């Protein structure tokens, strides 16, 4: 239930396009106990984890040094490309 | 109430002749006959054939007995 992520800076349209081509997925982390953080996660790894935990399963996100348990609040998908364009992670109060 | 637009309305005694029930209520009816009241005044009297006191439904009195059943009438008629 753990997948590593990398933080992101301000991005141009080209950068995000390169990220998705690389196979990484742009994402944001929000919720209780966390400020909004923009993160990138590998698509394949995310898909494996979500299968293990399910759609609403709690996930351990390696947000920089800290690790935050998160849920997939929402995701954006491209039907033609069969690719997840964006993922929203909601922090869960424990 | 506007003046001159309404019909003349006066307290009148409504009397049930059958049961001799007297009550005072307002009406526009004028009666030549006038009757005294408990209060020291005389009012025109309206005579009623029937009233709440006299009417059978109100009283619950059964003027006529219920119709006999077909079995009952047969036995009674022929004495069997």
């Amino acid at each position: 239930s753990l997948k590593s992520i990398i933080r992101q800076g301000k991005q141009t349209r080209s950068d995000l396009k390169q990220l998705r081509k690389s196979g990484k997925v742009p994402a944001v982390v929000y919720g209780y106990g966390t400020k909004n953080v923009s993160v990138k996660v590998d698509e394949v790894e995310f898909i494996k984890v979500i299968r293990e935990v399910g759609r609403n399963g709690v996930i351990e996100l390696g947000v920089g040094s800290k690790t935050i348990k998160v849920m997939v609040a929402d995701y954006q998908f491209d039907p033609l490309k069969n690719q997840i364009t964006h993922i929203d992670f909601l922090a869960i109060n424990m | 109430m506007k003046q001159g637009i309404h019909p003349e309305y006066h307290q009148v005694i409504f009397l049930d002749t059958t049961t001799n029930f007297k009550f005072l209520s307002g009406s526009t009816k004028t009666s030549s006959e006038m009757m005294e009241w408990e209060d020291g005044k005389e009012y025109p009297v309206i005579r009623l054939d029937i009233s709440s006191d006299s009417h059978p439904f109100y009283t619950g009195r059964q003027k006529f007995a219920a119709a006999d059943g077909r079995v009952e009438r047969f036995n009674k008629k022929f004495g069997l």
């Binding site: - | 309404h6 019909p7 309305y9 409504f14 009406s27 526009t28 009816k29 009623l48 029937i50 009233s51």
Partner: protein, 178 residues
């Protein structure tokens, strides 16, 4: 104020005991009585409405307010603003006097009277009574009346529910069909 006296003393006591009202103000009361006569025949003949107005004036002891059509309907041959009815609103002493007479005299005079319907409540503690003829009312004379006509009597009560309204009318001595 015989009907009012009963309400003030006997009826109030019965209702407050029955429904466990915290305050006297809670106890239900009859706000108004409105008598409505619909006269579509007036469209055909103006006189028919005039005769009705006189009858209602005699019955209630106050001049009726002529009611004019809200809209035009071809089937009824109705044009908007045409006088097709009369209404009277009875309040205060006039209301109690009329109501006591209705239960005491007019309702008894009703032909083949089997009591008033118990189901004639709007669901908001308001009761409407329909009279088949105005001959039932004592003031009206059979010779004077050219055409027998019915009337709608609406009794508006402060009571929230029909059951509370039914109790108020029963306490007044209104006959019910049961």
């Amino acid at each position: 104020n015989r009907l009012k006296e009963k309400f003030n003393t006997e009826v109030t006591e019965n209702l407050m005991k029955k429904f466990n009202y915290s305050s006297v103000m809670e106890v239900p009361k009859i706000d108004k009585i409105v008598v409505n006569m619909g006269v579509g025949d007036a469209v055909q003949n103006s006189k028919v409405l005039d005769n009705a107005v006189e009858e209602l004036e005699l019955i209630t002891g106050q001049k009726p307010l002529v009611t004019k059509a809200k809209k035009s309907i071809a089937t009824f041959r109705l044009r908007e603003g045409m006088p097709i009815g009369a209404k009277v609103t009875l309040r205060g002493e006039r209301m109690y006097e009329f109501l006591d007479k209705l239960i005491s005299v007019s309702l008894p005079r009703v032909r083949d009277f089997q009591g008033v319907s118990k189901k004639a409540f709007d669901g908001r503690g308001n009761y409407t009574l329909g009279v088949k003829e105005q001959l039932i009312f004592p003031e009206i004379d059979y010779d004077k009346v050219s055409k027998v006509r019915g009337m709608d009597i609406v009794i508006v009560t402060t009571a929230n529910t029909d059951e509370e309204a039914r109790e108020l009318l029963a306490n007044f001595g209104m006959p019910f069909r049961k």
